[PDB]
Amino acid sequence: SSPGIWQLDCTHLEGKVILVAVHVASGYIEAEVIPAETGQETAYFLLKLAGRWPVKTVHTDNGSNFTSTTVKAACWWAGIKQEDGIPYNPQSQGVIESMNKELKKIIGQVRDQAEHLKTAVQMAVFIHNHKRKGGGYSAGERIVDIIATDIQT
Amino acid sequence: SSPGIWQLDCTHLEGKVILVAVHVASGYIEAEVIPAETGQETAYFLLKLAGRWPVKTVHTDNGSNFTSTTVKAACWWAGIKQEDGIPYNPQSQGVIESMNKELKKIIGQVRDQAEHLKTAVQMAVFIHNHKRKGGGYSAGERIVDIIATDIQT
Ligand SMILES: O=C(O)CCc1ccc2c(c1)OCO2
Ligand SMILES: O=C(O)CCc1ccc2c(c1)OCO2
């Protein structure tokens, strides 16, 4: 639940991979399309993410990325504690499956407006992060308020 | 705004283009390497940026991107007001030249640790956003505080 905890989530669409990082406490996401989930892509995506948000802990999405020496190199470089993504509380997993289904639905709703899947995915990141949940807050609002509160201290 | 104002900046290294968005009030940046600055690339980069931060105004980096139909379509889609980037304030310009030189210096300092230019650029984005400047705050801390303060009004 802390401000720096993220979860990696890899889902498939149109024979391609969508890599998602979710900020567990807020539901805020960043996502990319990649031809396939290799250590190198995962490493690069974490590096990008950690340059943009204070990523302290990452729950890796599978044991291959947990093992990967490139992923471990990027976590070391960027000051990130790599953890497994084992859902010791089971509702965690249902939350992810639900987000994957939500995102693919958004992708479907914008698919026409975008020539490449990668554009549709960024439109879906946009809609997802701005959606007011519930005076309800968006995930965008939440992540910023969580990290600002954390900074003060 | 201020909280929502971003400036686009395009700089070259190794025959490649580095596209940068700077959050004016904090100095926080996001950046990408692209083969060349076209409207489509710039459009896609803005869509990614606006799905991640609440981007209200962008000062475009040149009149081609200002004019571009695709850039205008992305700005319309993501709710962004496009403006020219003319240094009405002249110190604005020198501020950017100095960041470009600073990013390039970081790039040179990490270039060895990275096979690809895109990796070195993301390392530089990381070092830039985390640097305390410095009881000194980082650009990452500033942008979060600026937007949190804004959400609480
Ligand atoms: O330092 C903190 O815990 C929060 C500050 C912060 C916010 C965004 C960042 C960042 C640091 O590094 C780059 O993106
Ligand atoms: O809503 C605001 O003014 C700030 C909240 C916020 C923060 C990050 C976001 C976002 C919205 O949408 C994209 O990523």
From Swiss-Prot, chains A, B:
It is found in: Virion; Host nucleus; Host cytoplasm. Residues 1-147 form the Integrase catalytic domain. Mg(2+) 3 binds at residues 9, 61, 97. It comes from the Viruses. The core domain contains the D-x(n)-D-x(35)-E motif, named for the phylogenetically conserved glutamic acid and aspartic acid residues and the invariant 35 amino acid spacing between the second and third acidic residues. Each acidic residue of the D,D(35)E motif is independently essential for the 3'-processing and strand transfer activities of purified integrase protein. Homotetramer; may further associate as a homohexadecamer. Part of the pre-integration complex (PIC) which is composed of viral genome, matrix protein, Vpr and integrase. Interacts with human SMARCB1/INI1 and human PSIP1/LEDGF isoform 1. Interacts with human KPNA3; this interaction might play a role in nuclear import of the pre-integration complex. Interacts with human NUP153; this interaction might play a role in nuclear import of the pre-integration complex. Catalyzes viral DNA integration into the host chromosome, by performing a series of DNA cutting and joining reactions. This enzyme activity takes place after virion entry into a cell and reverse transcription of the RNA genome in dsDNA. The first step in the integration process is 3' processing. This step requires a complex comprising the viral genome, matrix protein, Vpr and integrase. This complex is called the pre-integration complex (PIC). The integrase protein removes 2 nucleotides from each 3' end of the viral DNA, leaving recessed CA OH's at the 3' ends. This is Integrase. It comes from Human immunodeficiency virus type 1 group M subtype B (isolate NY5) (HIV-1). The gene is gag-pol.
